[PDB]
Design a binder for this molecule. Structure first.
Ligand SMILES: C=NC1=N[C@@H]2[C@@H](O)[C@H](O[C@@H]3O[C@H](CO)[C@@H](O[C@@H]4O[C@H](COC)[C@@H](O)[C@@H](O)[C@H]4NC(C)=O)[C@H](O)[C@H]3NC(C)=O)[C@@H](CO)[C@@H]2O1
Length: 365
């Protein structure tokens, strides 16, 4: 099975033991390492950090120590926008120009492929006309890839994509049965089902729902997201169960109603290293002295709380449960966001290096 792990190029700016650079990577940990993120510049693939090209060399240089390892560069992401995408796929010229830069770009820096992270077409200002143009973009990348394979004599560039769980988002711009045919694998983002953008606590990545849920709220969980991807045409071997090494935090209106569904007055206190309210890396959760951990029996994931802080996260156990579930489901593997959010250096949790992802490697392999 596949263990797809994402590296982020902003984790390098974190202070202390949280600073993450390629050297922090374990070559044998995952089967596929994805580099987030690359941007666009005049309909072309481009770097986002003063040192992406140096980082690229260390990233891809890991394949010497592990020749079976596969690397991809992802373009886009949540904070990328849609303009540049909607625009690049508008004319054959731009598509044809993007594609050619993609191939020259990946090869130049030794990437084995490209992971598309257009969040998302047919939404966030994307005319539902982009839904179908996306499909086209896919084939274009696929075709050029299959062709360049022949001419260059090297292995065919891989093509993946980070995809949303939401029925709404899926219908907005994803021709599933079609695009699944051209993607080598699909990175299902089964998280962010809940977060501080809501006025009641809920889990970031629940496997199942709680009895108390039905209707739309019923989909807000992994299994829901998974059936929703299979049913539409995705072959189980190409669907990859994405998992979070981060949880989402809320601030409780009252430190007395600390249950899943309680009143939250907003985001959870920013974490010391991640410094952004409503989210926390697992290593920020780990430590928590004099705190109370619970388990949502229905959704098989935990949560913790101390005073007015409430955070729904993923642990070693819930990860075992999820790999267990994807296995019964016959999914091609697990995807994880992100390497730098796990206690990658055994510096906080006392469970060694990469407690969660090491868990994944073990259960999966
Ligand atoms: C499996 N693919 C996948 N893609 C989605 C990712 O976009 C998303 O992670 C989020 O990506 C944002 C960038 O697109 C991150 O924004 C950065 O946030 C940090 C602070 O928090 C760490 C800022 O300092 C900036 O670096 C900011 N960058 C930009 C360009 O705005 C965001 O942090 C990150 N969120 C998390 C929890 O990691 C994942 C997960 O939802 C999806 O998975």
């Amino acid at each position: 099975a596949k263990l797809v792990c994402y590296f982020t190029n902003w984790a390098q700016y974190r202070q202390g033991e949280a600073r993450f650079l390629p050297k922090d990577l374990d070559p044998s940990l995952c089967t596929h390492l994805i580099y987030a993120f690359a941007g666009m510049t005049n309909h072309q693939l481009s770097t986002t950090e003063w040192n992406d090209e140096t980082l690229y060399q260390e990233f891809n240089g890991l394949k010497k120590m592990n020749p079976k390892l596969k690397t991809l560069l992802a373009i886009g992401g949540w904070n990328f926008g849609t303009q540049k995408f909607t625009d690049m796929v508008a004319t054959a010229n731009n598509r044809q120009t993007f594609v050619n830069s993609a191939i020259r770009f990946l090869r130049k820096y030794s990437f084995d492929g490209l992971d598309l992270d257009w969040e998302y077409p047919g939404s966030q200002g994307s005319p539902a006309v982009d839904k179908e143009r996306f499909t086209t973009l896919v084939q274009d990348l696929a075709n050029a890839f299959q062709q360049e394979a022949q001419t260059s004599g090297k292995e065919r560039l891989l093509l993946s994509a980070a995809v949303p769980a939401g029925q709404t988002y899926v219908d907005a711009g994803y021709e599933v049965d079609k695009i699944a045919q051209n993607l080598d694998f699909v990175n299902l983002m089964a998280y962010d089902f809940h977060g501080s953008w809501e006025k009641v606590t809920g889990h970031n990545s629940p496997l199942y729902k709680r009895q108390e849920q039905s209707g739309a709220a019923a989909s807000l969980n992994v299994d829901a997201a998974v059936q929703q991807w299979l049913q539409k045409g995705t072959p189980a071997s190409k669907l990859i169960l994405g998992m979070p090494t981060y949880g989402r935090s809320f601030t409780l209106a009252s430190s007395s109603d600390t249950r899943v569904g309680a009143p939250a007055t907003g985001s959870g206190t920013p974490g010391p290293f991640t410094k952004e309210g409503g989210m926390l890396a697992y290593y920020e959760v780990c430590s928590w002295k004099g705190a109370t951990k619970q388990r949502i029996q229905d959704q098989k994931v935990p949560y913790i709380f101390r005073d007015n802080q409430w955070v729904g996260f993923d642990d070693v156990e819930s990860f075992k449960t999820k790999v267990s579930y994807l296995k019964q489901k016959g999914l091609g593997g697990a995807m994880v966001w992100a390497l730098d959010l796990d206690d990658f250096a055994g510096f906080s949790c006392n469970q060694g290096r990469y407690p969660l992802i090491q868990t994944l490697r073990q259960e999966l392999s």
